[PDB]
């Protein structure tokens, strides 16, 4: 059995290996990468996403979100407070201001320590889920806007055409910007490219151990749990590595730097934070191996988790017994 300890694996594909995306995902899985829930992919030296990032400042962040915490340093929720629009240039300036800039620090571990110690006492602002792409149209390899769609995967595996589209999203982050513990919608894969700026630290629970995290989460956020049987899909709960370790939860951590891809695997819970101003691009995707995860994915039907158009078809086809309840929640 490959990668039995579920370690995060790091890959260095050659330019030839970088041609066929699906083939490389399958290769990583042949090596046990999925057991971790997350893998890093360092592109070959010959590859670039686009020529420069000199011309990005006029992108609009129509609804920046201020992430306001409640709870305790290691066990907290965050709510997103809507802010007035601003451009990416304006946002970069804000991220670099004295109020929001990354403190002095010795290394990634010192900064991680500062994050967990102090995150709750600040409310960073971020740009999330902005439809768009920063890949040049002439980038043929690992262009997140040119992957096979999940609708086409489903049609190829199961035989039925469905409505829906699948496009990438941009994220503009700053110091302490946080992504809460979650799996993807319908336990899909995600791919994630860090275009520019400071790192993003990730935490991940092996898929085979995801229920352990769910059990702990229900214990640590009891009101939330009573509210919804799948409340982690609300994407608001944070649990620190110290707390996870105290509770015996299997996990791993890694830091992504500019120019690196991260793949999350079906049912791999993940969370993390940004070190400073950055821009990332992400999209969900599927493979044949996903289908059985999609059929078994939990769903939030309490109403809090988000209206999702492309999701409808996935629930309708893969989870017909749950469909009507899920839809009432939409
Ligand atoms: N699935 N990918 C993730 O959950 C991380 C997405 C990129 C991100 N960066 N800050 N919040 N989100
Ligand atoms: Cl700090
Ligand atoms: Ni995610
Ligand atoms: Zn819910």
CSV table of C-alpha atoms and ligand atoms in Angstrom, one decimal:
chain,number,residue,atom,x,y,z
A,1,UNK,CA,0.0,0.0,0.0
A,2,UNK,CA,1.5,3.3,-1.1
A,3,UNK,CA,2.0,6.2,1.3
A,4,UNK,CA,0.5,4.3,4.3
A,5,UNK,CA,1.3,7.1,6.8
A,6,UNK,CA,-0.7,9.6,4.5
A,7,UNK,CA,2.2,12.1,4.2
A,8,UNK,CA,1.8,15.1,1.9
A,9,UNK,CA,3.8,14.3,-1.2
A,10,UNK,CA,5.5,16.8,-3.4
A,11,UNK,CA,5.9,16.2,-7.2
A,12,UNK,CA,8.3,17.6,-9.7
A,13,UNK,CA,6.9,16.7,-13.2
A,14,UNK,CA,9.0,17.2,-16.2
A,15,UNK,CA,7.8,19.3,-19.1
A,16,UNK,CA,6.7,16.1,-20.9
A,17,UNK,CA,4.8,14.9,-17.8
A,18,UNK,CA,3.0,18.2,-17.5
A,19,UNK,CA,1.2,17.8,-20.8
A,20,UNK,CA,-1.6,15.5,-19.8
A,21,UNK,CA,-3.3,16.7,-16.6
A,22,UNK,CA,-5.5,13.7,-15.9
A,23,UNK,CA,-2.7,11.3,-16.5
A,24,UNK,CA,-0.5,13.1,-13.9
A,25,UNK,CA,-3.3,13.2,-11.3
A,26,UNK,CA,-3.6,9.4,-11.9
A,27,UNK,CA,0.1,9.0,-11.5
A,28,UNK,CA,0.2,10.9,-8.2
A,29,UNK,CA,-2.6,8.7,-7.0
A,30,UNK,CA,-0.6,5.6,-8.1
A,31,UNK,CA,2.0,6.8,-5.6
A,32,UNK,CA,-0.5,7.2,-2.8
A,33,UNK,CA,-0.7,11.0,-2.9
A,34,UNK,CA,-4.4,11.1,-2.3
A,35,UNK,CA,-4.0,9.4,1.1
A,36,UNK,CA,-2.8,12.7,2.5
A,37,UNK,CA,-5.7,14.7,1.1
A,38,UNK,CA,-3.3,17.3,-0.4
A,39,UNK,CA,-0.3,17.2,-2.7
A,40,UNK,CA,2.1,19.9,-3.9
A,41,UNK,CA,3.1,20.1,-7.5
A,42,UNK,CA,6.1,22.1,-8.5
A,43,UNK,CA,5.9,22.9,-12.3
A,44,UNK,CA,8.9,22.3,-14.5
A,45,UNK,CA,11.3,25.1,-14.9
A,46,UNK,CA,10.3,25.7,-18.5
A,47,UNK,CA,6.7,26.6,-17.5
A,48,UNK,CA,5.1,29.8,-16.7
A,49,UNK,CA,1.4,30.8,-15.9
A,50,UNK,CA,1.6,34.2,-17.7
A,51,UNK,CA,4.3,36.6,-18.6
A,52,UNK,CA,4.0,39.1,-15.8
A,53,UNK,CA,1.7,40.3,-13.1
A,54,UNK,CA,2.4,43.9,-13.8
A,55,UNK,CA,-1.1,44.6,-15.2
A,56,UNK,CA,-3.5,43.2,-12.6
A,57,UNK,CA,-4.2,46.3,-10.4
A,58,UNK,CA,-7.5,47.2,-12.1
A,59,UNK,CA,-9.2,44.0,-11.3
A,60,UNK,CA,-12.2,44.7,-9.1
A,61,UNK,CA,-12.9,43.1,-5.8
A,62,UNK,CA,-16.6,43.8,-5.8
A,63,UNK,CA,-17.3,42.6,-2.3
A,64,UNK,CA,-14.2,42.3,-0.1
A,65,UNK,CA,-15.0,40.4,3.1
A,66,UNK,CA,-13.7,41.2,6.6
A,67,UNK,CA,-13.2,38.0,8.5
A,68,UNK,CA,-14.3,38.6,12.1
A,69,UNK,CA,-13.6,35.9,14.7
A,70,UNK,CA,-15.4,34.7,17.8
A,71,UNK,CA,-14.3,32.0,20.3
A,72,UNK,CA,-10.8,31.3,21.5
A,73,UNK,CA,-7.5,31.4,19.9
A,74,UNK,CA,-7.4,27.8,18.9
A,75,UNK,CA,-11.2,27.1,18.5
A,76,UNK,CA,-13.1,29.9,16.7
A,77,UNK,CA,-15.6,30.7,14.1
A,78,UNK,CA,-15.4,33.5,11.6
A,79,UNK,CA,-18.1,35.5,9.9
A,80,UNK,CA,-17.7,37.5,6.8
A,81,UNK,CA,-18.6,41.1,6.9
A,82,UNK,CA,-19.1,42.8,3.5
A,83,UNK,CA,-17.0,45.8,2.6
A,84,UNK,CA,-17.1,48.4,-0.1
A,85,UNK,CA,-15.6,47.4,-3.5
A,86,UNK,CA,-12.0,48.1,-4.3
A,87,UNK,CA,-9.5,47.3,-6.9
A,88,UNK,CA,-6.7,44.9,-6.5
A,89,UNK,CA,-4.3,47.9,-6.4
A,90,UNK,CA,-6.2,49.4,-3.6
A,91,UNK,CA,-6.3,46.0,-1.8
A,92,UNK,CA,-2.6,45.5,-2.2
A,93,UNK,CA,-2.0,48.9,-0.6
A,94,UNK,CA,-4.3,48.0,2.2
A,95,UNK,CA,-2.6,44.6,2.8
A,96,UNK,CA,0.7,46.4,3.0
A,97,UNK,CA,-0.5,49.1,5.5
A,98,UNK,CA,0.6,49.1,9.0
A,99,UNK,CA,-2.7,47.8,10.3
A,100,UNK,CA,-2.6,44.7,8.0
A,101,UNK,CA,1.0,43.9,7.1
A,102,UNK,CA,2.7,40.7,8.0
A,103,UNK,CA,4.8,41.2,11.2
A,104,UNK,CA,8.5,40.6,11.3
A,105,UNK,CA,9.2,36.8,11.7
A,106,UNK,CA,12.1,34.4,11.6
A,107,UNK,CA,10.7,31.6,9.4
A,108,UNK,CA,7.3,29.9,8.4
A,109,UNK,CA,7.1,28.2,11.9
A,110,UNK,CA,7.4,31.5,13.8
A,111,UNK,CA,4.8,33.0,11.6
A,112,UNK,CA,2.5,30.0,12.2
A,113,UNK,CA,2.9,30.5,15.8
A,114,UNK,CA,2.0,34.2,15.6
A,115,UNK,CA,-1.0,33.3,13.4
A,116,UNK,CA,-2.5,30.9,16.0
A,117,UNK,CA,-1.7,33.1,18.9
A,118,UNK,CA,-3.1,36.3,17.5
A,119,UNK,CA,-5.5,35.7,14.6
A,120,UNK,CA,-8.7,36.2,16.6
A,121,UNK,CA,-7.7,39.7,17.7
A,122,UNK,CA,-7.6,41.0,14.1
A,123,UNK,CA,-10.1,41.0,11.3
A,124,UNK,CA,-8.3,40.8,7.9
A,125,UNK,CA,-10.0,41.6,4.7
A,126,UNK,CA,-10.0,39.4,1.6
A,127,UNK,CA,-11.2,39.0,-1.9
A,128,UNK,CA,-12.8,35.6,-2.5
A,129,UNK,CA,-14.5,33.6,-5.1
A,130,UNK,CA,-14.0,36.2,-7.8
A,131,UNK,CA,-14.8,34.5,-11.1
A,132,UNK,CA,-11.9,34.9,-13.4
A,133,UNK,CA,-8.4,33.7,-14.4
A,134,UNK,CA,-4.9,35.0,-14.5
A,135,UNK,CA,-3.6,32.2,-16.8
A,136,UNK,CA,-2.5,33.4,-20.2
A,137,UNK,CA,-4.6,31.8,-22.9
A,138,UNK,CA,-1.4,30.6,-24.5
A,139,UNK,CA,-0.5,28.5,-21.4
A,140,UNK,CA,-1.3,25.1,-22.5
A,141,UNK,CA,-0.2,23.0,-19.5
A,142,UNK,CA,-2.1,23.2,-16.2
A,143,UNK,CA,-4.2,26.1,-17.2
A,144,UNK,CA,-7.0,26.2,-14.7
A,145,UNK,CA,-9.4,27.7,-17.1
A,146,UNK,CA,-8.9,24.9,-19.6
A,147,UNK,CA,-9.4,21.8,-17.7
A,148,UNK,CA,-12.0,19.2,-18.5
A,149,UNK,CA,-15.3,20.0,-16.9
A,150,UNK,CA,-17.0,18.1,-14.1
A,151,UNK,CA,-20.2,18.0,-16.2
A,152,UNK,CA,-18.3,16.3,-18.9
A,153,UNK,CA,-16.7,13.9,-16.5
A,154,UNK,CA,-20.0,12.9,-15.2
A,155,UNK,CA,-21.4,12.4,-18.6
A,156,UNK,CA,-18.4,10.3,-19.6
A,157,UNK,CA,-18.7,8.1,-16.5
A,158,UNK,CA,-22.4,7.8,-16.1
A,159,UNK,CA,-23.8,8.6,-19.6
A,160,UNK,CA,-26.1,11.5,-19.0
A,161,UNK,CA,-25.6,15.1,-20.2
A,162,UNK,CA,-26.2,17.7,-17.5
A,163,UNK,CA,-26.5,21.5,-17.5
A,164,UNK,CA,-23.8,23.5,-15.8
A,165,UNK,CA,-20.4,25.1,-16.1
A,166,UNK,CA,-17.2,25.0,-14.2
A,167,UNK,CA,-14.9,28.1,-14.2
A,168,UNK,CA,-12.0,29.3,-12.0
A,169,UNK,CA,-12.0,31.7,-9.1
A,170,UNK,CA,-9.5,34.2,-7.9
A,171,UNK,CA,-8.6,34.9,-4.3
A,172,UNK,CA,-6.7,38.0,-3.1
A,173,UNK,CA,-5.4,37.5,0.5
A,174,UNK,CA,-3.5,39.3,3.2
A,175,UNK,CA,-1.8,38.4,6.4
A,176,UNK,CA,-4.2,36.3,8.6
A,177,UNK,CA,-6.7,35.8,5.8
A,178,UNK,CA,-8.2,32.4,6.7
A,179,UNK,CA,-9.9,29.5,5.0
A,180,UNK,CA,-11.9,27.4,7.4
A,181,UNK,CA,-12.0,23.6,7.7
A,182,UNK,CA,-13.9,22.1,4.8
A,183,UNK,CA,-14.1,19.6,2.1
A,184,UNK,CA,-15.1,20.7,-1.4
A,185,UNK,CA,-18.7,20.8,-2.6
A,186,UNK,CA,-19.8,17.3,-3.3
A,187,UNK,CA,-16.3,16.1,-2.1
A,188,UNK,CA,-14.8,17.2,-5.4
A,189,UNK,CA,-11.0,17.6,-6.0
A,190,UNK,CA,-9.6,21.2,-6.0
A,191,UNK,CA,-6.6,22.6,-7.7
A,192,UNK,CA,-5.0,25.7,-6.5
A,193,UNK,CA,-2.3,27.9,-8.0
A,194,UNK,CA,-0.5,30.6,-6.1
A,195,UNK,CA,0.1,33.2,-8.8
A,196,UNK,CA,1.9,36.0,-6.8
A,197,UNK,CA,2.9,37.1,-3.4
A,198,UNK,CA,3.4,35.7,0.0
A,199,UNK,CA,2.8,32.1,1.0
A,200,UNK,CA,-0.3,30.2,2.0
A,201,UNK,CA,0.0,27.6,4.8
A,202,UNK,CA,-2.3,24.5,4.6
A,203,UNK,CA,-3.5,22.0,7.1
A,204,UNK,CA,-5.1,18.8,5.9
A,205,UNK,CA,-6.7,15.6,7.3
A,206,UNK,CA,-6.3,12.3,5.3
A,207,UNK,CA,-9.6,11.3,3.7
A,208,UNK,CA,-9.6,8.0,5.5
A,209,UNK,CA,-9.7,10.0,8.8
A,210,UNK,CA,-12.2,12.8,7.9
A,211,UNK,CA,-14.9,11.5,10.2
A,212,UNK,CA,-12.5,12.0,13.2
A,213,UNK,CA,-12.3,15.6,12.4
A,214,UNK,CA,-16.1,15.8,12.0
A,215,UNK,CA,-16.6,14.3,15.4
A,216,UNK,CA,-14.2,16.7,17.1
A,217,UNK,CA,-15.9,19.6,15.3
A,218,UNK,CA,-19.2,18.6,16.6
A,219,UNK,CA,-17.8,18.5,20.1
A,220,UNK,CA,-16.1,21.9,19.8
A,221,UNK,CA,-19.0,23.8,18.1
A,222,UNK,CA,-22.0,22.3,19.7
A,223,UNK,CA,-24.6,24.9,18.8
A,224,UNK,CA,-23.5,24.8,15.2
A,225,UNK,CA,-23.7,21.1,15.1
A,226,UNK,CA,-27.2,21.1,16.4
A,227,UNK,CA,-28.1,23.5,13.7
A,228,UNK,CA,-26.8,21.5,10.8
A,229,UNK,CA,-25.6,17.9,10.4
A,230,UNK,CA,-23.0,19.0,7.9
A,231,UNK,CA,-22.1,22.4,9.4
A,232,UNK,CA,-18.5,22.3,8.3
A,233,UNK,CA,-19.8,23.0,4.8
A,234,UNK,CA,-20.7,26.4,6.1
A,235,UNK,CA,-16.9,27.1,6.0
A,236,UNK,CA,-16.7,29.1,9.2
A,237,UNK,CA,-15.0,26.9,11.8
A,238,UNK,CA,-11.3,26.9,12.7
A,239,UNK,CA,-9.4,24.4,14.9
A,240,UNK,CA,-5.6,25.0,15.5
A,241,UNK,CA,-3.0,22.3,15.0
A,242,UNK,CA,-2.4,22.3,18.8
A,243,UNK,CA,-6.0,21.4,19.4
A,244,UNK,CA,-6.0,18.8,16.7
A,245,UNK,CA,-2.9,17.2,18.2
A,246,UNK,CA,-4.4,17.3,21.8
A,247,UNK,CA,-7.3,15.4,20.4
A,248,UNK,CA,-5.4,12.9,18.4
A,249,UNK,CA,-6.6,14.0,15.0
A,250,UNK,CA,-4.4,12.8,12.1
A,251,UNK,CA,-3.2,15.8,10.1
A,252,UNK,CA,-0.4,17.3,8.1
A,253,UNK,CA,0.7,20.8,7.2
A,254,UNK,CA,2.6,22.4,4.4
A,255,UNK,CA,3.3,25.8,3.1
A,256,UNK,CA,2.7,26.7,-0.6
A,257,UNK,CA,4.8,29.4,-2.3
A,258,UNK,CA,4.2,31.5,-5.4
A,259,UNK,CA,4.5,29.4,-8.5
A,260,UNK,CA,3.3,26.1,-6.9
A,261,UNK,CA,0.1,24.1,-7.3
A,262,UNK,CA,-1.7,22.3,-4.6
A,263,UNK,CA,-4.3,19.6,-5.3
A,264,UNK,CA,-6.9,18.6,-2.7
A,265,UNK,CA,-8.4,15.2,-3.0
A,266,UNK,CA,-11.9,14.0,-2.5
A,267,UNK,CA,-13.0,14.2,1.1
A,268,UNK,CA,-9.6,15.7,2.2
A,269,UNK,CA,-10.5,18.3,4.8
A,270,UNK,CA,-8.4,21.4,4.7
A,271,UNK,CA,-7.9,24.8,6.2
A,272,UNK,CA,-5.2,27.4,6.2
A,273,UNK,CA,-4.0,31.0,6.1
A,274,UNK,CA,-2.1,33.6,4.1
A,275,UNK,CA,1.2,35.0,5.1
A,276,UNK,CA,0.7,38.4,3.4
A,277,UNK,CA,-0.6,39.9,0.2
A,278,UNK,CA,-1.1,37.2,-2.4
A,279,UNK,CA,-3.2,36.0,-5.3
A,280,UNK,CA,-4.3,32.5,-5.9
A,281,UNK,CA,-6.6,30.8,-8.5
A,282,UNK,CA,-8.6,27.7,-7.8
A,283,UNK,CA,-11.1,25.4,-9.4
A,284,UNK,CA,-12.8,22.2,-8.6
A,285,UNK,CA,-12.4,19.1,-10.8
A,286,UNK,CA,-13.4,15.4,-11.0
A,287,UNK,CA,-11.9,12.1,-12.1
A,288,UNK,CA,-13.4,8.7,-12.4
A,289,UNK,CA,-12.4,8.0,-8.8
A,290,UNK,CA,-14.4,10.9,-7.6
A,291,UNK,CA,-17.8,9.5,-8.6
A,292,UNK,CA,-18.2,7.3,-5.6
A,293,UNK,CA,-17.2,10.1,-3.3
A,294,UNK,CA,-19.8,12.3,-5.0
A,295,UNK,CA,-22.5,9.7,-4.4
A,296,UNK,CA,-21.7,9.6,-0.6
A,297,UNK,CA,-21.0,13.3,0.1
A,298,UNK,CA,-22.9,14.8,3.0
A,299,UNK,CA,-25.0,17.8,2.3
A,300,UNK,CA,-26.0,20.9,4.1
A,301,UNK,CA,-29.7,21.4,3.8
A,302,UNK,CA,-30.2,23.9,6.7
A,303,UNK,CA,-29.9,26.8,4.4
A,304,UNK,CA,-26.7,28.4,5.4
A,305,UNK,CA,-24.4,26.7,2.9
A,306,UNK,CA,-24.7,28.7,-0.5
A,307,UNK,CA,-26.9,28.6,-3.5
A,308,UNK,CA,-24.9,26.6,-6.0
A,309,UNK,CA,-26.2,26.2,-9.6
A,310,UNK,CA,-23.9,23.6,-11.0
A,311,UNK,CA,-24.3,21.7,-7.8
A,312,UNK,CA,-27.9,20.9,-8.4
A,313,UNK,CA,-27.3,18.5,-11.2
A,314,UNK,CA,-24.6,16.6,-9.2
A,315,UNK,CA,-27.1,16.1,-6.3
A,316,UNK,CA,-30.0,15.3,-8.7
A,317,UNK,CA,-28.1,12.6,-10.5
A,318,UNK,CA,-25.8,11.1,-7.8
A,319,UNK,CA,-28.1,11.5,-4.8
A,320,UNK,CA,-31.7,11.3,-5.9
A,321,UNK,CA,-33.0,10.3,-2.5
A,322,UNK,CA,-31.5,13.6,-1.0
A,323,UNK,CA,-32.4,15.9,-3.8
A,324,UNK,CA,-35.7,17.3,-2.7
A,325,UNK,CA,-34.4,18.0,0.8
A,326,UNK,CA,-31.2,19.6,-0.5
A,327,UNK,CA,-33.2,21.7,-2.9
A,328,UNK,CA,-35.6,23.0,-0.2
A,329,UNK,CA,-32.3,24.2,1.5
A,330,UNK,CA,-31.3,26.1,-1.7
B,1,LIG,N1,-10.0,24.4,-2.0
B,1,LIG,N2,-9.1,25.4,-1.9
B,1,LIG,C1,-9.1,26.0,-0.8
B,1,LIG,O1,-9.9,25.8,0.1
B,1,LIG,C2,-8.2,27.2,-0.7
B,1,LIG,C3,-8.7,28.3,-1.7
B,1,LIG,C4,-7.8,29.5,-1.8
B,1,LIG,C5,-8.0,30.4,-0.7
B,1,LIG,N3,-7.2,31.2,-0.2
B,1,LIG,N4,-7.7,31.8,0.8
B,1,LIG,N5,-8.9,31.4,0.9
B,1,LIG,N6,-9.2,30.5,0.0
B,2,LIG,CL1,0.5,38.9,14.7
B,3,LIG,NI1,-11.1,24.1,-0.5
B,4,LIG,ZN1,-26.1,23.8,7.1
